[PDB]
Amino acid sequence: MTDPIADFLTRLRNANSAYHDEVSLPHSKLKANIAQILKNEGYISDFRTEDARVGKSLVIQLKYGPSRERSIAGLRRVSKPGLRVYAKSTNLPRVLGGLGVAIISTSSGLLTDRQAARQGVGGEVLAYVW
Amino acid sequence: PTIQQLVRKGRRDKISKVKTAALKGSPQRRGVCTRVYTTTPKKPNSALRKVARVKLTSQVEVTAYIPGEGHNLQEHSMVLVRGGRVKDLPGVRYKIIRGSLDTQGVKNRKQARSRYGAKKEK
RNA sequence: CGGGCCUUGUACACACCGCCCGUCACGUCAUGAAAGUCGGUAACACCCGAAGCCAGUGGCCUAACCCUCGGGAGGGAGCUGUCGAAGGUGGGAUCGGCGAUUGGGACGAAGUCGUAACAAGGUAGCCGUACCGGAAGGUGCGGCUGGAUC
RNA sequence: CAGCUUGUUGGUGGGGUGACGGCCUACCAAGGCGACGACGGGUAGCCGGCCUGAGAGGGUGUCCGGCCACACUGGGACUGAGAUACGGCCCAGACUCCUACGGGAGGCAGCAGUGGGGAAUAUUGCACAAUGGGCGCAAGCCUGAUGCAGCGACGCCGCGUGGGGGAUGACGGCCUUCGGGUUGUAAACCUCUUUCACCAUCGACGAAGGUCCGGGUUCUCUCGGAUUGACGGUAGGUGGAGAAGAAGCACCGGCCAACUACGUGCCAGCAGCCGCGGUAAUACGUAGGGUGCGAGCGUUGUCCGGAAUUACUGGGCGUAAAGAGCUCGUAGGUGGUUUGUCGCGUUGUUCGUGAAAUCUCACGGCUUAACUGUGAGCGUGCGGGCGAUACGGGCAGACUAGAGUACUGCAGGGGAGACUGGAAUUCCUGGUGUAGCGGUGGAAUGCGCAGAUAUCAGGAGGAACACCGGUGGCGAAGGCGGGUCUCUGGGCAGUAACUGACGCUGAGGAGCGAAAGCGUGGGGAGCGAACAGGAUUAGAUACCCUGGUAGUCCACGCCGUAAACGGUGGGUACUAGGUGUGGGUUUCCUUCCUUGGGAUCCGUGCCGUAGCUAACGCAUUAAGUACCCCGCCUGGGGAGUACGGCC
RNA sequence: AGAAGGGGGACCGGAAUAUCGUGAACACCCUUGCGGUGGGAGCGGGAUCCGGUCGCAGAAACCAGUGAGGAGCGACUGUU
Ligand SMILES: [Mg+2]
Ligand SMILES: [Mg+2]
Ligand SMILES: [Mg+2]
Ligand SMILES: [Mg+2]
Ligand SMILES: [Mg+2]
Ligand SMILES: [Mg+2]
Ligand SMILES: [Mg+2]
Ligand SMILES: [Mg+2]
Ligand SMILES: [Mg+2]
Ligand SMILES: [Mg+2]
Ligand SMILES: [Mg+2]
Ligand SMILES: [Mg+2]
Ligand SMILES: [Mg+2]
Ligand SMILES: [Mg+2]
Ligand SMILES: [Mg+2]
Ligand SMILES: [Mg+2]
Ligand SMILES: [Mg+2]
Ligand SMILES: [Mg+2]
Ligand SMILES: [Mg+2]
Ligand SMILES: [Mg+2]
Ligand SMILES: [Mg+2]
Ligand SMILES: [Mg+2]
Ligand SMILES: [Mg+2]
Ligand SMILES: [Mg+2]
Ligand SMILES: [Mg+2]
Ligand SMILES: [Mg+2]
Ligand SMILES: [Mg+2]
Ligand SMILES: [Mg+2]
Ligand SMILES: [Mg+2]
Ligand SMILES: [Mg+2]
Ligand SMILES: [Mg+2]
Ligand SMILES: [Mg+2]
Ligand SMILES: [Mg+2]
Ligand SMILES: [Mg+2]
Ligand SMILES: [Mg+2]
Ligand SMILES: [Mg+2]
Ligand SMILES: [Mg+2]
Ligand SMILES: [Mg+2]
Ligand SMILES: [Mg+2]
Ligand SMILES: [Mg+2]
Ligand SMILES: [Mg+2]
Ligand SMILES: [Mg+2]
Ligand SMILES: [Mg+2]
Ligand SMILES: [Mg+2]
Ligand SMILES: [Mg+2]
Ligand SMILES: [Mg+2]
Ligand SMILES: [Mg+2]
Ligand SMILES: [Mg+2]
Ligand SMILES: [Mg+2]
Ligand SMILES: [Mg+2]
Ligand SMILES: [Mg+2]
Ligand SMILES: [Mg+2]
Ligand SMILES: [Mg+2]
Ligand SMILES: [Mg+2]
Ligand SMILES: [Mg+2]
Ligand SMILES: [Mg+2]
Ligand SMILES: [Mg+2]
Ligand SMILES: [Mg+2]
Ligand SMILES: [Mg+2]
Ligand SMILES: [Mg+2]
Ligand SMILES: [Mg+2]
Ligand SMILES: [Mg+2]
Ligand SMILES: [Mg+2]
Ligand SMILES: [Mg+2]
Ligand SMILES: [Mg+2]
Ligand SMILES: [Mg+2]
Ligand SMILES: [Mg+2]
Ligand SMILES: [Mg+2]
Ligand SMILES: [Mg+2]
Ligand SMILES: [Mg+2]
Ligand SMILES: [Mg+2]
Ligand SMILES: [Mg+2]
Ligand SMILES: [Mg+2]
Ligand SMILES: [Mg+2]
Ligand SMILES: [Mg+2]
Ligand SMILES: [Mg+2]
Ligand SMILES: [Mg+2]
Ligand SMILES: [Mg+2]
Ligand SMILES: [Mg+2]
Ligand SMILES: [Mg+2]
Ligand SMILES: [Mg+2]
Ligand SMILES: [Mg+2]
Ligand SMILES: [Mg+2]
Ligand SMILES: [Mg+2]
Ligand SMILES: [Mg+2]
Ligand SMILES: [Mg+2]
């Protein structure tokens, strides 16, 4: 078992494709921060933290339209544990030509491309969501 | 496969084959043109092709094709050889240049007249 | 014997009067082995060792310095020694060429011998191994279905 | 190419150098390098750059610029601030030349030039006028550097061979359905202008300079005077007459713009591919027509592209090439939740550097352009300082979810050894008994009449274990079933008692690994390669029949391969269900005795949704969605072959 | 395989007075013996390095392997 962030992305993607309304998954600070970013960008509905048998459990409810369509189109881990990926403020990645979101881990916390270019800081490219 | 596997063992391009072997870097090559003869092509063509055995100045013996209709070649005679395939003769990969040291141009030729060698008219 | 419909297998579609395998014979091309033979390369051990630097010796020569005028100091010629290129001797290494004869390979026409595979291809076929046989191959043992059977 | 190294690795004292240093020496110690490729072999000057490419990349190192190396081949030193000392010295060698034979001389990879090699690459030109260089107080003198010229379409750029009107559808050519169409405003003719070439003439900038003479005393400054330019009487300007001196090459089946006629008739020939030509060829040759480009146009050679056919960006492995036969494990790679710290990675900013030229963007100057100057970019980087701590990493802790241990149960052809049971086949002994038996599609070979086959009793011996038995179980795989005993490995469930990330994978390596085969010894019923006979057949080195050796069995070793298969590497998480079956646990329905239903964990099958796939199909036991590590693929043959090596 | 093929070899002096290695006298304890420990004399052995000397020659005379390559037969030591 390696790369829990990729595990988190895979769980969310599979549930979103299976048309599920919520997911459960072991809670870590990094996952909580990524969930906060996703909610702020509007790709999910609200999330919450429970207390499982051992440790804590993180539950995310997924957002769908009036018809049954997904608000999340894709998801892909970028900086894998076998090859870390970093970027500078000059050349932060662009997702769907700007219609998506790329998560950047900076010394000031997790940020999106817009929030990171407006601050002029780079860092590790965690994942694309769009 | 596996960036670590690539780091340990990089990509290696394919192996090509030299085609200019007798010319060995030169665009043309002089030869002595021994033992001129004729050859029948591969199965579905049934023609009579005019060829020659050329001993090149690169100290290699190759077989060349004589283009055009009608030629003045013979036994020992200096020719200028270039590259080119015939696709029906089995292993001929060289052509005699017409309009060079001993191979005079094609007589009565009127179209394209530069291949095969021919001055316009005077 | 021929025909019709459905279903099954197929490497056939010129459509089984189909496709197709391997020896053998003739020819061409490239290549392996081979008693031996001709070249190249880089070293190694030892012998001999030019110039030259360095180290010694130096009765032969020596203007400046010193001298008690006899010489002394210091220098040089020559000579010896270490190192030393080239050369010589020797045993190997390595890269090529040729070689009577011989092994297979590929391609050639409308050659000879069979018919191994493709249909249950007429003994299901393939895989490993062993023996055998002009040749495709056969047989034994184990395996697989990429075969059948109620 | 797997072992290299003995001044080798290090130390001490000396020596030596401009300088540290095994740079050298005497002594002492026994180290040093290597799978992150030492040692060896091949090739090569390196870079700014150039070509290509969307980029990343790939190829390349020619003009120009920087650095290095060398100067007939090898070695050496001297002089000097400084030496690979190209036109210096010494020695040796090869070569060319002179000689009175004793002995001497030489070095174009400087410019120009000659022979040779080659497909192929230039004049034995002018000037120190400008810039740089050396010596001199200076004037000066030297400079094949340099500045120019000559030659070559070798390349890039620019401009010409006219312009404005004009169906005689001139003439002719070619095609025609013989009616016409086309070349075609194209020509004739009318008119206009002369860029460039031609003729004549004037004539430079490059020179706020170099010289001598005058104010300025000199220094600095103008002044004015001569004089000084190789290019060059050139560029350029002016003037003169005249459309006047000036277009070719390739292709026209598809790619790919461009079609007909005649001749030829698998011939002659064409061709990048696949193809075109055997009597009506848009593919051969000519003509007409057309298309592209144009002082050029084609061919050959080489590089990139297209090629996502080496895939980092950006590919794959069920059946197309591709998962090692399976496991354990070394280096390596990768790593659960959580606290603090460091600030190596990462990221922000600033300073230095990243030469010039080339490249990009904007101007500026040559009549335009190529070319040239300026400014800003670019220069992805590296070094120094100062910030940040989300993530990676290090250091110091913590935790139990992964992993392991403990206890209690459970199922099992898991393995090894020893002993042992019965059915049946064969043979031997005896009884009964008489002429056939055996075998095939049909027969024959064969056995028997010397007593077979058949039948009954006794005995010997080897091998395999009917029913149970299955689709089912166990094992990493290969594999494992007569029974009992002895020894021994793993798995699952429950508990949550313990440790506290101890995990995963794994290049090489090691172990195990069907059958056949090999060695030594034993055993040998049945079966049965080879071998023999019979039959079939044209033949039958086979299929069928009758015999029959090795082998099959055992002990101990070797071998190391299989369609060793799920043709699917291992680990982990997640993503509808339905329905069988093996092993547990478990409430409730607890009797509804039902050992039924439900729930949960671990197996093993079928069917099916999403999803995936070229399709077939896979589908919670993935070939789906993702992450970590490993093996493997790059058209078919030659070939899993040769040579080398290991066993 | 002593494969092949090479190099050194005499004398004198010095290192060298424990140079080094053998044995161990005078003199040092004691369970007093035919005892032990240190001690290092005299007497012998061998090798090296450095310097010098001599001849045509340093293995000095006598003594004391020739070596390599390709076939045939028999494996080999042996026996006649
Ligand atoms: Mg009908
Ligand atoms: Mg079909
Ligand atoms: Mg042949
Ligand atoms: Mg050979
Ligand atoms: Mg000397
Ligand atoms: Mg031969
Ligand atoms: Mg067969
Ligand atoms: Mg057949
Ligand atoms: Mg048959
Ligand atoms: Mg058959
Ligand atoms: Mg047989
Ligand atoms: Mg077989
Ligand atoms: Mg079988
Ligand atoms: Mg030493
Ligand atoms: Mg020292
Ligand atoms: Mg070179
Ligand atoms: Mg590309
Ligand atoms: Mg040299
Ligand atoms: Mg020369
Ligand atoms: Mg020299
Ligand atoms: Mg000087
Ligand atoms: Mg000096
Ligand atoms: Mg020199
Ligand atoms: Mg020279
Ligand atoms: Mg010279
Ligand atoms: Mg000089
Ligand atoms: Mg020259
Ligand atoms: Mg030539
Ligand atoms: Mg020539
Ligand atoms: Mg000058
Ligand atoms: Mg000057
Ligand atoms: Mg030309
Ligand atoms: Mg077209
Ligand atoms: Mg015709
Ligand atoms: Mg034609
Ligand atoms: Mg290409
Ligand atoms: Mg590419
Ligand atoms: Mg990739
Ligand atoms: Mg592919
Ligand atoms: Mg895979
Ligand atoms: Mg296949
Ligand atoms: Mg395959
Ligand atoms: Mg497998
Ligand atoms: Mg490890
Ligand atoms: Mg680890
Ligand atoms: Mg680590
Ligand atoms: Mg971590
Ligand atoms: Mg620059
Ligand atoms: Mg301008
Ligand atoms: Mg910095
Ligand atoms: Mg546990
Ligand atoms: Mg046993
Ligand atoms: Mg018996
Ligand atoms: Mg009887
Ligand atoms: Mg009986
Ligand atoms: Mg604890
Ligand atoms: Mg492992
Ligand atoms: Mg391995
Ligand atoms: Mg074994
Ligand atoms: Mg066996
Ligand atoms: Mg055996
Ligand atoms: Mg045998
Ligand atoms: Mg035996
Ligand atoms: Mg039998
Ligand atoms: Mg038989
Ligand atoms: Mg027979
Ligand atoms: Mg295999
Ligand atoms: Mg198997
Ligand atoms: Mg396989
Ligand atoms: Mg797996
Ligand atoms: Mg997997
Ligand atoms: Mg089940
Ligand atoms: Mg596909
Ligand atoms: Mg299915
Ligand atoms: Mg697939
Ligand atoms: Mg082999
Ligand atoms: Mg071999
Ligand atoms: Mg010897
Ligand atoms: Mg010998
Ligand atoms: Mg002497
Ligand atoms: Mg002897
Ligand atoms: Mg022989
Ligand atoms: Mg003989
Ligand atoms: Mg004998
Ligand atoms: Mg024998
Ligand atoms: Mg003997």
Q: Which nucleotide is nearest to B40 (CA to C1')?
A: C108
Helix A4-18 with A29-41: angle, nearest 10 deg:
40
In angstroms, the CA A73 to CA A13 distance is 9
* Residue B110: CB atoms within 10 Å: 9
Among B111, B97, B104, CA closest to B30: B97
> Strand pairing partners for B53?
B34, B63
Which chain B residues are Cβ-neighbours of A83 within 8 angstroms? 3
> Strand pairing partners for A86?
A124
Among B95, B101, B64, B66, CA closest to B82: B95
* B91 CB below 7 A from strand C atoms: yes
Query: Would you tell me which residues 75-94 of chain A have a C-beta closer than 8 angstroms to some C-beta of chain B?
Result: 82-83
In angstroms, the CA B14 to CA A83 distance is 27
CA B56, B67, B86 angle in degrees (round to 5)?
A: 80
Q: Which residue of A has its CA nearest to B4?
A: A82
Resolution of the structure, angstroms: 2.7
In angstroms, the CA B35 to CA A42 distance is 85
DSSP annotation of A13: H
In angstroms, the CA B99 to CA B119 distance is 10
Query: Do strands B61-65 and B94-96 pair parallel, antiparallel, or not at all (unpaired)?
Result: parallel
Contacts of residue A126, Cβ cutoff 8 Å, sequence gap at least 6: A5, A34, A77, A78, A79, A103, A104, A105, A110
CB contact under 8 A, B2 and A82: yes
> Strand pairing partners for A49?
A58
Let me know: does A60 contact A23? Beta carbons within 8 Å.
yes
> Strand pairing partners for B38?
B50
Encoded tokens for A126: 């965690």
Among B102, B89, B88, CA closest to B30: B102
Encoded tokens for B79: 């020719």
Encoded tokens for A5: 């962030």
CA-to-C1' span, A64 to E68 (A): 98
CA B78, B80, B86 angle in degrees (round to 5)?
A: 120
DSSP annotation of A59: E
Q: Report in angstroms the alpha-carbon separations of A97 from A94, A101, A130, B69, B105.
A: 6, 10, 10, 64, 63
Encoded tokens for B118: 């021919």
Which chain B residues are Cβ-neighbours of A85 within 8 angstroms? none
Q: How far is CA A62 from the centre of its chain?
A: 13
- Give the closest-approach CA distance of A101 to chain B in angstroms: 26
Which region holds residue A37: left if phi is over 0, alpha if psi is between -120 and 50, else beta?
alpha
Let me know: does B117 contact B103? Beta carbons within 8 Å.
yes
CA-to-C1' span, A128 to E16 (A): 90
In angstroms, the CA A30 to CA A60 distance is 15
In angstroms, the CA A103 to CA A92 distance is 10
- Which strand (E) or helix (H) includes residue A34? helix A29-41
Strands across the sheet with A47-49, in order?
A22-26, A57-61, A47-49
In angstroms, the CA B75 to CA B46 distance is 26
Residues counted in chain B: 122
- How far away, in angstroms, is A84 Cα from ligand 46 center? 15
